[PDB]
Amino acid sequence: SVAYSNNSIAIPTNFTISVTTEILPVSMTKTSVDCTMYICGDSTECSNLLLQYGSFCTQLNRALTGIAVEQDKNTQEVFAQVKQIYKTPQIKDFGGFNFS
Amino acid sequence: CTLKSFTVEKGIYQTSNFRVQPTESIVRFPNITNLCPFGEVFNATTFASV
Numbered sequence: 001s002v003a004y005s006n007n008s009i010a011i012p013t014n015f016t017i018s019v020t021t022e023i024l025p026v027s028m029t030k031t032s033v034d035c036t037m038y039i040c041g042d043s044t045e046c047s048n049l050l051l052q053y054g055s056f057c058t059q060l061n062r063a064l065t066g067i068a069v070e071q072d073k074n075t076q077e078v079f080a081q082v083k084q085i086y087k088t089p090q091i092k093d094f095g096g097f098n099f100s
Numbered sequence: 101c102t103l104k105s106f107t108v109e110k111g112i113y114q115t116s117n118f119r120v121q122p123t124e125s126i127v128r129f130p131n132i133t134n135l136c137p138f139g140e141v142f143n144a145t146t147f148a149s150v
């Protein structure tokens with residue numbers, strides 16, 4: 001409960017510096033699928049009836065390639081916000097802060 | 101052939117996996133020489149009731 005009045009206020013007298021960690025995914029593993037190898041397998045008897053479903057195979061491959069290029073775009077976008085690359089300074093002399 | 105077109109632009113174009121041609125062939129069967137007794141069970145003089 002809060003000790004609330006109509007003429008009373010509370011004011012801090014000190015401060016505390018705090019640090020927290022936030023973890024977010026950026027990209028996932030890129031994959032590709034060879035439909036003919038996964039289905040028939042070193043079979044001349046098969047892979048002759050897959051001429052009808054080659055269109056579906058192409059559709060799957062197109063979707064997977066789109067996913068992969070999207071993953072590359074995400075990885076580039078997250079970390080490459082700034083272009084100029086700055087070398088770390090030699091002398092620290094940051095007034096006390098230790099960034100080791 | 102994979103793209104089903106005559107013009108290809110730039111790209112990486114992950115094509116189908118490579119294969120190796122099995123130029124030879126073998127047959128392996130157990131050591132059986134004597135023929136089956138076809139005459140014994142086909143040319144039997146007597147046959148049992150159903």
Ligand SMILES: *[C@@H]1O[C@H](CO)[C@@H](O)[C@H](O)[C@H]1NC(C)=O
Pocket residue numbers: 013014015
């Ligand atoms: C504020 O907190 C620090 C560390 O907890 C302490 O050294 C300092 O004395 C505090 N300030 C006052 C006015 O008590």
Ligand SMILES: *[C@@H]1O[C@H](CO)[C@@H](O)[C@H](O)[C@H]1NC(C)=O
Pocket residue numbers: 139143
């Ligand atoms: C096989 O059958 C035929 C007719 O059923 C007969 O003439 C012949 O003698 C038979 N041979 C043997 C080896 O039993």
